[PDB]
Symmetry: D2
Subunit: 215 residues, 4 copies
């Protein structure tokens, strides 16, 4: 399961442990204890704020996104990450170039297409400088500091359903930067596919964002 994001990014499901019943199983071991009663249990937990059971469902995603997006994403501390190193490996000539539509709703002094060019220009100059420095003998960890924030990076993300729902509340929301919103929509999609009951209950009683209830 893979979903393309932005111009060169993506979100792909690597692994998953459990499903909706994993939360039911965990929670049930509380009352010292059926598709109908179990699904209702999930609604009950979601409705009353008992989310610890959902921590027993875990996902591992492989993500490709611009650094400025990853910086916001990595602020979510209740999760595990492993990302490509700009000091250990040579960075690929891959940058996020906003589409003209990105600026829609904004009256700019110059046509959107021009903005696209300006950004692509800097990217090109920075990357060339980067390559020159390396070939010149400068260590990679130093050379890459001239590279712009829209440079793509990749990382593995392991997170449980509870932290994932917090992520969606904050990132699958109009207040979050559009770019990460797009990734969050992808995460939600995959989450829905693997845990329909939990996702359904989440949207109905806990989800605090706005966009998931309109897309």
């Amino acid at each position: 399961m893979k979903i393309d994001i932005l111009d060169k990014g993506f979100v792909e499901l690597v692994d998953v442990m459990g499903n909706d019943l994993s939360a039911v199983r965990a929670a049930r071991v509380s009352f010292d204890m059926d598709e109908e009663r179990d699904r209702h249990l999930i609604e009950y937990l979601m409705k009353h704020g008992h989310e610890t059971p959902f921590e027993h469902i875990v996902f591992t995603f492989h993500v490709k996104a611009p650094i400025f997006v990853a910086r916001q994403w990595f602020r979510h501390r209740i999760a595990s990450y492993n990302e490509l190193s700009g000091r250990y490996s040579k960075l690929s000539y891959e940058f996020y170039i906003p589409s003209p539509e990105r600026l829609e709703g904004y009256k700019t002094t110059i046509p959107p297409e021009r903005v696209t060019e300006k950004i692509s220009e800097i990217v090109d100059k920075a990357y060339r400088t980067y390559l020159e420095l390396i070939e010149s003998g400068v260590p990679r960890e130093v050379a890459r500091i001239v590279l712009p924030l829209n440079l793509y990076t990749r990382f593995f993300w392991t997170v449980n359903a509870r932290s994932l729902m917090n992520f969606l509340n904050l990132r699958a929301d109009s207040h979050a930067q559009w770019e990460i919103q797009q990734y969050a929509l992808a995460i939600a999609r995959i989450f829905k596919e693997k845990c329909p009951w939990t996702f359904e209950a989440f949207l109905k009683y806990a989800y605090k964002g706005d966009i998931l209830k309109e897309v």
Copy 2:
């Protein structure tokens, strides 16, 4: 995989995400070569690069005495869900030390006596507990008379990194003998599911003193 512990407890594997290769894929950030992948696991462990192992996750079902659970629950980097003494009626299941548990201490009374002394207050406490309930006393208040050796059950979801920290601390002679027994069981299961990580752990990071002397 279900292993009996003490007189009435157990450790059961409920689920697991990944295997040794999960740590390898995460470290490389990719997606093949047994020799190279195994080498990487050792490399990561030897140099303290522990984060890749967080991508391996386990869910256990555990039955243990509350005094053991209290120590176990001090490990904050994990998820727990346990039976409630205020929501359900507690079963008559208590941990009675084996006659050999005190074999090594200068005791004045015979092992059978200790067993009888413990079994005695246990029976009295539970009887009192049931009495209060039947009398209308809320469960949450009635259970306060129950001894710390009462058995409880919980689900534990933890990643390999935090699990290794648990083994360093609990699979060790300094920890209470009772939790050591559980830690040995967790270690066996870990070893079965992640042989490479487990071996590299014992070889380069394990800080305890029993897993190196004991088998699996």
Copy 3:
């Protein structure tokens, strides 16, 4: 500040880092700003609270000294985003101190025997249990084993260091009617101390983020 809880327990403030302004300074770095005036700053706290910007409050930290029954501590210790250090039954000779519910504790439930009867039967188990505990020790039984006969109402002690964000989550969950009465009582004391040290944050918390019920009916 040392508030008595239940019959022998307590909550005491050991230390604190920062105050309402600590959260303001933290939040301001976002817009490349610092403090302003007490009017604008207090407005920010309220603003942060109502919009779900919780991280700034993580910069306010408290350390409490708590004495409570083990069954209460077990619930308390489930809050993982905090630090704890507790008295050890493996390393220390536990003293004779147990939580004996007051007669009023059962007020509201139609029981068979008198509230005073429940009291005596609880104290009975306690005495017999502690009795056996000392005997086992006197007999050479190591403390870590001897204590397993002790009941859950035995009092324990611990230090608790937690930041304002986690503390608010604690209050949402424990200063609430769904939590056991015993820990509710402790949560009220935590709230009282919180209110005194961070009045702006506290007030903003009750009006905008607090999800519990009792703090809106009870004072401080």
Copy 4:
């Protein structure tokens, strides 16, 4: 309060502190139902805790730092999850013209084609070009959050960092080390200096029995 300048335009500034060495002693002492004692026994306890890996007591010592560092350094720093952060926003505020320009010495031990002076020149140039484009887009009507994506990783950012002594020591083990990038090493050294100043005993014990790095 303390402030140490790092790199060409950065700094590490102590904002607040909760507790001191004795805070760890008090927290630890509760285990034996005890409290503070003399200076000789208390300091000895700290070394004891450190030696045997009993680290929880140190979690009761907390610091709040105010840091100004380039983004590439901050990204590594923010990987330390057991802490609290609040940082300057590129989508909410106009970013200032401050970039980390390596000094000629930075390339020490590295023989490069073009003179180090030239490396400095080239870095400043791309930096200048990117920033001007940034302002151009901003005055052009482009949202701050979009315009800033052309800015390089050596752009200076600012943030508040609240961390307890236990996590701080893990930070030093990893960042106050030759394996970590030189730039963050410099920040780590300033962090250690402040730590030492505020918690002499803890720091001394840490360096003698727990510190895993190689530059302190």
